Amino acid sequence: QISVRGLAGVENVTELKKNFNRHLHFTLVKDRNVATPRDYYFALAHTVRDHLVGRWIRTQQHYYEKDPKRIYYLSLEFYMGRTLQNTMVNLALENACDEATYQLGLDMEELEEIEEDAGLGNGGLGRLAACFLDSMATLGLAAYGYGIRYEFGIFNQKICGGWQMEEADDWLRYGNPWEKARPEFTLPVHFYGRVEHTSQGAKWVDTQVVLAMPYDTPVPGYRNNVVNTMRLWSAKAPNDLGGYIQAVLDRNLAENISRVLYPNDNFFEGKELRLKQEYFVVAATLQDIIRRFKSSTNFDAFPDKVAIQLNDTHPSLAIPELMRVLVDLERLDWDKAWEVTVKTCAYTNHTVIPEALERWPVHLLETLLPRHLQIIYEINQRFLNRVAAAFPGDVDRLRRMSLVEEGAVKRINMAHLCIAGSHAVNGVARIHSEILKKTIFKDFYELEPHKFQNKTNGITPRRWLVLCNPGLAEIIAERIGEEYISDLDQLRKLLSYVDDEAFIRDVAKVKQENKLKFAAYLEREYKVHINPNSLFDVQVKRIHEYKRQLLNCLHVITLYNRIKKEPNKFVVPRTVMIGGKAAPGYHMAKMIIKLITAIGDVVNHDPVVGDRLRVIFLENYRVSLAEKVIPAADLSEQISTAGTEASGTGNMKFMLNGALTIGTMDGANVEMAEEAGEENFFIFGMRVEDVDRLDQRGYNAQEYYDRIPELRQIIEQLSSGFFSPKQPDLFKDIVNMLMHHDRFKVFADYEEYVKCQERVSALYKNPREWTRMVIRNIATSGKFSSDRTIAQYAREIWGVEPSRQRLPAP
Amino acid sequence: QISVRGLAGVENVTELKKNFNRHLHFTLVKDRNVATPRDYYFALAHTVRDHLVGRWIRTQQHYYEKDPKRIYYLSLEFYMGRTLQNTMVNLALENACDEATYQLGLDMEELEEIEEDAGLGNGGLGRLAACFLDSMATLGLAAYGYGIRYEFGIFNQKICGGWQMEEADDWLRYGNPWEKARPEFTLPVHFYGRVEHTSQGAKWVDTQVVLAMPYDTPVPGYRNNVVNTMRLWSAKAPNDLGGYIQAVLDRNLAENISRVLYPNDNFFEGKELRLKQEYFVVAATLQDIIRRFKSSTNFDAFPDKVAIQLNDTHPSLAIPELMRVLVDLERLDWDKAWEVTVKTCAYTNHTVIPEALERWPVHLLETLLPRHLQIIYEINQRFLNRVAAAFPGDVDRLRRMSLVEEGAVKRINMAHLCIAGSHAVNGVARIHSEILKKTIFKDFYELEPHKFQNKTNGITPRRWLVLCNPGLAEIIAERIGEEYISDLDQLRKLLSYVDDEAFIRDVAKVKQENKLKFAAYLEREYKVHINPNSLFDVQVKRIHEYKRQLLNCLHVITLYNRIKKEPNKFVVPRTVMIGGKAAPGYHMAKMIIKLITAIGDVVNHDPVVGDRLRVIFLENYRVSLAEKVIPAADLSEQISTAGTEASGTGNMKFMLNGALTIGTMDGANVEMAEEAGEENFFIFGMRVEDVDRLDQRGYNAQEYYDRIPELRQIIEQLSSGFFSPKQPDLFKDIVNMLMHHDRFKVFADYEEYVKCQERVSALYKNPREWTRMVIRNIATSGKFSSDRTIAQYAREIWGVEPSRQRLPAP
Ligand SMILES: *Cc1c(COP(=O)(O)O)cnc(C)c1O
Ligand SMILES: *Cc1c(COP(=O)(O)O)cnc(C)c1O
């Protein structure tokens, strides 16, 4: 059908149909008479999977022969989403499979909807790991993603009575055709025990053993025949067990380690199970790395053949674990082992929010990992000696930089451990990286300035453009070719089409088709009533106070009140869509979701409003839903308080898909506006400097409430029960927070936000100019490709050169 | 190589090799350079499995079209063993696969040893279910085996310091290529709750729900293209869940139902988890049966289209569950529902031992299955009204026949429930069935004589002859053809070769080769030292006091003492092998194992003994080990106290494989001696009548101890610490039991047993005559084919005719 989807050759299609029927018969053990849509999905998946194996085997054989430096990306989250379409795209099999299934009398799009999302992540941090894997494969790097195979990913969200309800994400129920269990490579992981000091070195004895079983999933590069690996560990109890029956049943105690993903987004919860998960992934991965290193004993070359990237501090135990192995097992002297460790590890920070920082209680590490605690203490001591030497007499700096935090209970600052044991520390957006050097990590930057870098986040244009928005990818390819898909900077060539009447019309047509498509999906599933002609105003991301879904709510209520005030006055029609999950134990986030649905209950049923304003809460927001709503959006809401969103990535997805952005100068928003030009962005609100000034003076919400009549009305409506008749004080906690303890200054940006939104509605009334501004955004989104991000990590941190060379065919 | 293994055609072999390499590549994702023997085993398994799917699909389609009466065999145990070789045998693919792998440079026998036994059973009862499935498929019956997919089967037995150690049987670790998960057919099972009585009927509400997920395994008939199904249920928690994390982790509470097989053989343990397993299998299976019935609403025809066979009382809840469904859900009147239930169910009893009888406490059923308890009470009441009417005034008979047992705690006699709700009740050997009518079920037989039948057990000649003893199957086929493999009575034709010098020599040659083969295996694995020229005296079966492994021990010690008394006197060399597992909580059985190894520690290292006597304990006895040792045996020990072994099946395996039998007139031994002629059997000991006389008088072990010098010496050796130097009183419990509370009268059969063993050694000294007697046994073993057993069940209980017709090809 469309060019960018590859060729559907006679031989190829015939071969596909043949193999589809083979799998349906032999693999699924079914015949055409009893097969269900799910059976058909699996037959297709196995058929596509087959095309991947040959390349997978020779890619790995290739690395074994050329022995390049390996990149190990350690993360406790890999937010993969679905794998079928992405695999077809990267193998240029999409049109062929579409035709093959068409001839078999099946609708491929219907089959793709059956696949379960691999939701092994919470949000930004986990999805970045996913985009990164795609870019590393596309850039020909010998990379391996290492994580945990949770049998339950991020919970599925159900909305009942306007409230969030959580249900287990049993994504493996029907099986996972993409993974390959590798029981032969199982490794032991140790916990508890005690440390024994013998003549020649310390020994960690009397430990509890849990086995780590690896499951490998292929990661295909874009049309370059490279297929890398994502290895996920699963917990298994050893076989060596009222006495008998119970002993067997207790095996699940050990296997609970990989049972479920902790649903906290940017929030630290010091639970023992979480700590076990963190060590489990680190211990198994490091043995795997070392094993592979010794195959093709000086460890001096270790840093030249190995690079370990820590995604946040979750896998920070890799630092002391690597030291433990080198010093305790390999018997290297401390100083030598430390040099190797520092040169091997690099750390990526994802937030400056205090409640998100990992600070593990000493008594927990003491019981669970006694040897690691001793190593951490030794690291801290030698580090502080270095600080004392560089800043003589500065005793306060000593306590500020210590990895050990005194107080009620002693804690280990994992962020400090990561900086001390890494040769590179990076922020994820220019403003974020600057904030790290100027504030929270100022002391460390002063001691070792060379370690601090910036690596602005990015997204993969394969999943976030070609896969989810084929219509847009096609009209773009029509003018500039297909080269941009793996070289996004080429989109700048689109700048010469900003006055092209044909292009303007096509860009607008693609958006309209996406909106109609999504509007239908909302009806087909969930039975809603949105109007395709309205402006699609969307804010999708995890529910968090710093994200400010509440500021958006205030605007919605403002719009509704203005309409009720002057009913027959014209207003640009809008469909406000808000979606995202709230962590199960985050009360305020759960109240915000209820507020949104409550507002919808009033606004969507008011006769005077009509179809001029609709408020919809997008249920169960996840990767596959993002692929649907983002291409249909007109306005992207990125309104976090300045200085709180380290980077953001959703913002980049919206920009690449033709939506204009309304946001604060926070995270990557600053760089996006810089690339597209501020006049092509809807910027508003306090800048980081403004927030600091307010904090110096002291934030008093009452002041805003007293001086802004429209705001006062909203707060009084919430308080009086206008949005909760049967429960008048239902939102008392929300009002109290906004009025007395709002860490994110919602009221402070209210006025500028509302005015900015007016400028948005004004531009939307002029279709031609709205579309021209859209073209200016899409054309300058190239910098946000994760291929650019990965190329920088490769050259500036890992010391390897990316390659676009096709691997010697399949 | 050998005839009975089929043809290895040019096209077939080429096709096999091609598909072997396909699976190694695409299925296992490996190449010739990194593949291990296990990888090769799986490639072969998947290749053979492929040949099974086509027949499997059309067999089931066939039943759907012809709609014959279905046979449902309900059992909590299916002792399957390995599946690879058995599948090749039944598909006539053995020689082809042997050649194909040979050309690929692989040894198929080495690959077969890699497969994990499917040990979902304890012993006799579970293996019978397995043989039965094979025979039902071979006889073309539309049969389905229904059970539980335990993730842990019978524990693997390790011997440490002479003691049994148990370790988890993680048989699914590397995956099971034979099963096919059918998540689409998942069914809900209810537990707990309470009963509500409404206007129109009772309702079971507020229940806890556990899902039953089925896994189907194919069961191929012998060269008839029939492939039946064994459906095993797996427990899964529903998705509808500190609050969050814990809720997810607690899912394993529900999934523990199918976690592990209870390791008790012929012993009842009233644990709640076991009760849940029993209802789980019954509830899921009955919904599946009814669903299938309604597809191709009078339930009057239900008995004409459905037959449910209960293997022991474990699945006895099927009776009240069927009533519950018909009365509560389908709304049939009681009397109508009961008529249907009785005509549908049939019960098979496996033992008369009191401690093995299931008597569930009322308070347990009351809490777990409140509605079923009410139904059982109603059944009991109407049954007793029938008894009161037939035997007016006989109040003691009323309490004796009641399904409800009064006493310390009220219990439900599940055996009584089975008789009341079944149209047929059968014993498993003539003597056993007679004992049921004369003793434990005498009252029931008097009330309904027509219900009681006999169905002597049998074994499948495919696994127990062709598969494990190809050498013997071949020399037999050389004279009488291959027809006997599915018509074992033809072995009688071998009677005309009893004087054939060529045959006598071949039979003896095959046995010698099997012994050398096994002797090697004992060395290769476990490093032992047996002598192939000695008489292989073996007793393999579960360790139990009624089996009398102790009587055997006494003989061994007697032999050892006689040698020490007259060292230079000639004695026929023997290798005594004893094997079997002991239930984890059965103390005496565990002490018996230690005694055996202890005896070996003394006997095997005494210089004076030399290689004239060896005592070896066969570790981890299981189906695959049985296939190895049985063909190598010269003497089969079947020495249970008369009246305690209902039938036995191991005895039949030894008879079919050329071993002579030394045993009591118990179980099927009586029928075996009857078929072969008593002069061709080594019968000894008390008969059932003799045991009763002794009980009338009162058994006093002391009498035997006082009158038999050799026996007194043995007991004094055990007591003094002769077999346990460091621990003199180690076997005090054994001696005390033998002397004061031996329920099985070991001493009473000692003298006759020893004398009989002398007659055995005498015959062994005459190779020619020993072999001629062996031929007389093999030739008359035909009656013990499970094909005969199944044909009788079909005609006399299920009302269906067996068929030997080939199904319309694959
Ligand atoms: C891209 C993405 C995110 C991150 O969005 P932000 O707005 O940067 O927080 C979160 N969830 C999903 C499903 C995503 O695809
Ligand atoms: C045949 C068999 C049994 C039953 O043997 P008996 O001597 O009748 O108790 C037990 N275990 C296994 C592994 C068997 O193959």
Nearest to A248 among B245, B251, B260 (CB): B260
Ligand 1 mean position, distance from CA A463 (Å): 13
Question: What is the distance between the alpha carbons of residues B489 and A710, in angstroms, rounded to a whole number?
Answer: 99
CB distance B82 to ligand 2 below 6 Å? no
Selecting among B350, B511, B612, B745, the annotated active-site residue is B350
Name chain B contacts of A175, Cβ cutoff 8 Å: 181, 183
Ligand 2 mean position, distance from CA B123 (Å): 5
CB distance B127 to ligand 2 below 6 Å? yes
H helical segments located in B617-745: 623-629, 650-656, 669-676, 688-697, 701-707, 709-720, 732-740
Ligand 2 mean position, distance from CA B165 (Å): 20
| Residue A738 near residue A715 (C-beta atoms within 8 A) | yes
**Which amino acid belongs to residue A393?**
G
Question: Is B506 exposed, middle or buried, given 0-12, 13-18 or 19+ CB atoms closer than 10 A?
Answer: buried
**Which amino acid belongs to residue A185?**
F
Question: What is the distance between the alpha carbons of residues A70 and A73, in angstroms, rounded to a whole number?
Answer: 10
| Residue A21 near residue A36 (C-beta atoms within 8 A) | no
How many Å separate Cα A287 from the centre of its chain?
27
Question: What is the distance between the alpha carbons of residues B750 and B554, in angstroms, rounded to a whole number?
Answer: 8
Radius of gyration of chain B (CA): 27
Q: Which of B100, B256, B303 is nearest to B798 (CA)?
A: B303
- CA A402 vs CA A341, A362, A389, A446: distances in Å: 19, 14, 14, 15
Q: Which of A78, A798, A72 is nearest to A453 (CA)?
A: A798
| Residue A801 near residue A676 (C-beta atoms within 8 A) | no
How many of the other CB atoms lie within 10 Å of CB of A342?
18
Q: Are β-strands B613-618 and B574-579 bridged in parallel, bridged antiparallel, or unpaired?
A: parallel
3-state secondary structure at position A536: strand
Mutate to test the pocket of ligand 2, among B86, B154, B456, B540 (most ligand atoms within 8 A of CB): B540
Contact flag B585-A242 (C-beta cutoff 8 Å): yes
Q: In what order do the strands lie in the sheet with B404-405?
A: B359-361, B411-413, B404-405
How many Å separate Cα A475 from the centre of its chain?
28
| Residue A735 near residue A719 (C-beta atoms within 8 A) | yes
Q: Does B27 touch chain A (CB under 8 A)?
A: no
Radius of gyration of chain A (CA): 27
**Which amino acid belongs to residue B710?**
E
Match 């709510």 to its residue by tokens.
A553
| Residue A189 near residue A211 (C-beta atoms within 8 A) | yes
Name chain B contacts of A168, Cβ cutoff 8 Å: 239, 241, 248, 251
Annotated binding site of B: 31, 64, 291-296
Of the bound ligands, which one is closest to the alpha carbon of residue B82? 2
Q: Are β-strands A404-405 and B201-205 bridged in parallel, bridged antiparallel, or unpaired?
A: unpaired
Of the bound ligands, which one is closest to the alpha carbon of residue A669? 1
The tokens for A725 are 């008749």
Max CA distance (Å), chain A: 90
Atom of ligand 1 nearest to the CA of A621: 13
The tokens for A531 are 């109007």
Q: How many CB contacts within 8 angstroms connect chain A with chain B?
A: 97
Residues of B (251-270) whose Cβ lies below 8 Å from A:
251-252, 256, 259-260, 262-263
The tokens for A555 are 């605007």
Contact flag A57-B29 (C-beta cutoff 8 Å): yes
Contact flag B183-A170 (C-beta cutoff 8 Å): no
**Site from A51, A241, A248 to mutate, B interface, most B CB atoms within 10 angstroms:** A248
Atom of ligand 1 nearest to the CA of A81: 13
Breaks in chain B after residues (C–N exceeding 2.5 Å): 240, 241, 296
- The CATH number assigned to the domain with range B459-785 reads 3.40.50.2000
Tell me whether residue A534 is annotated as binding: no
Element (DSSP H or E) covering residue A209: strand A208-220
Of the bound ligands, which one is closest to the alpha carbon of residue A624? 1
Contact flag A168-B241 (C-beta cutoff 8 Å): yes
Name chain A contacts of B41, Cβ cutoff 8 Å: none
Count Cβ neighbours within 10 Å for each residue of B261-271 and write b for 16 or more, e otherwise.
Answer: bbbbbbbbeee
Specified resolution (Å): 1.9
Sequence-separated (6 or more) residues with CB below 8 Å from residue B672: B651, B652, B655, B661, B681, B781, B784
Where in chain A are the domains?
Answer: 1-458+786-807, 459-785
Residues of A (129-188) whose Cβ lies below 8 Å from B:
152, 155-156, 166-168, 170, 173-175, 180-181, 183-184
Count Cβ neighbours within 10 Å for each residue of A215-240 and write b for 16 or more, e otherwise.
Answer: bbbbbbbbbbbbbbbbbbbbbbbbee
Tell me whether residue A295 is annotated as binding: yes
**Which amino acid belongs to residue A131?**
C
Question: What is the distance between the alpha carbons of residues B373 and B138, in angstroms, rounded to a whole number?
Answer: 40
Question: Is B27 exposed, middle or buried, given 0-12, 13-18 or 19+ CB atoms closer than 10 A?
Answer: buried
Tell me whether residue A5 is annotated as binding: no
| Residue B536 near residue B634 (C-beta atoms within 8 A) | yes
Question: What is the distance between the alpha carbons of residues A419 and A411, in angstroms, rounded to a whole number?
Answer: 17
Q: With respect to CATH, is domain A1-458+786-807 assigned 3.30.70.100?
A: no
CB distance B623 to ligand 2 below 6 Å? yes
Q: Does B705 touch chain A (CB under 8 A)?
A: no
Mutate to test the pocket of ligand 1, among A134, A428, A462, A541 (most ligand atoms within 8 A of CB): A541
Selecting among B541, B544, B574, B612, the annotated active-site residue is B541
Question: What is the distance between the alpha carbons of residues B688 and B666, in angstroms, rounded to a whole number?
Answer: 8
Mutate to test the pocket of ligand 1, among A542, A624, A664 (most ligand atoms within 8 A of CB): A542
Same fold, B1-458+786-807 and B459-785: yes
Ligand 2 mean position, distance from CA B463 (Å): 13
Question: What is the distance between the alpha carbons of residues A381 and A377, in angstroms, rounded to a whole number?
Answer: 6
Ligand 1 mean position, distance from CA A80 (Å): 12
Q: Does B25 touch chain A (CB under 8 A)?
A: yes
Name chain B contacts of A263, Cβ cutoff 8 Å: 244
- CA A158 vs CA A315, B243, B462: distances in Å: 31, 17, 55
How many Å separate Cα A204 from the centre of its chain?
36
Q: Name residue B639's beta-bridge partners.
A: none
Element (DSSP H or E) covering residue B587: helix B587-603
Match 């896969």 to its residue by tokens.
A467
Nearest to B183 among A174, A248, A271 (CB): A174
3-state helix, strand, coil in chain B (%, to 5): 50, 15, 30
C-alpha atoms less than 13 angstroms from C-alpha of B537 in its C-beta half-sphere: 26
Question: What is the distance between the alpha carbons of residues A328 and A196, in angstroms, rounded to a whole number?
Answer: 11
CB distance B579 to ligand 2 below 6 Å? no
| Residue A594 near residue A732 (C-beta atoms within 8 A) | no
What are the phi and psi torsion angles at B637 (to 5°)? -95, 110
Axis-axis angle for helices B84-91, B94-103 (nearest 10): 120
Mutate to test the pocket of ligand 2, among B78, B120, B122, B127 (most ligand atoms within 8 A of CB): B127
Q: What residues does ligand 1 touch, defined as CB less than 6 Å away?
A: A 123-124, 127, 541, 622-623, 626, 648-650, 653
What are the phi and psi torsion angles at A452 (to 5°)? -80, 125
Method: X-ray
Report angle CA A740, A746, A751 to the nearest 5 degrees.
Answer: 120
The catalytic residue positions of A are 350, 541-542, 547, 649, 653
The tokens for B609 are 């003994």
DSSP code for B641: P
Report angle CA B740, B742, B746 to the nearest 5 degrees.
Answer: 115
Nearest CA in chain B to A259: B249
Written in H, E and C, the secondary structure of A505-516 is HHHHHHHHHHHH
DSSP string, B280-330: HHHHHHHHHHHHHHT----STTHHHHEEEEEESSTTTTHHHHHHHIIIIIS
Question: Is B450 exposed, middle or buried, given 0-12, 13-18 or 19+ CB atoms closer than 10 A?
Answer: exposed
H helical segments located in A361-500: 362-368, 370-390, 395-401, 414-420, 430-438, 442-447, 470-480
Contact flag A183-B166 (C-beta cutoff 8 Å): no
Question: What is the distance between the alpha carbons of residues A549 and A778, in angstroms, rounded to a whole number?
Answer: 25
Contact flag A245-B271 (C-beta cutoff 8 Å): yes
| Residue B408 near residue B359 (C-beta atoms within 8 A) | no
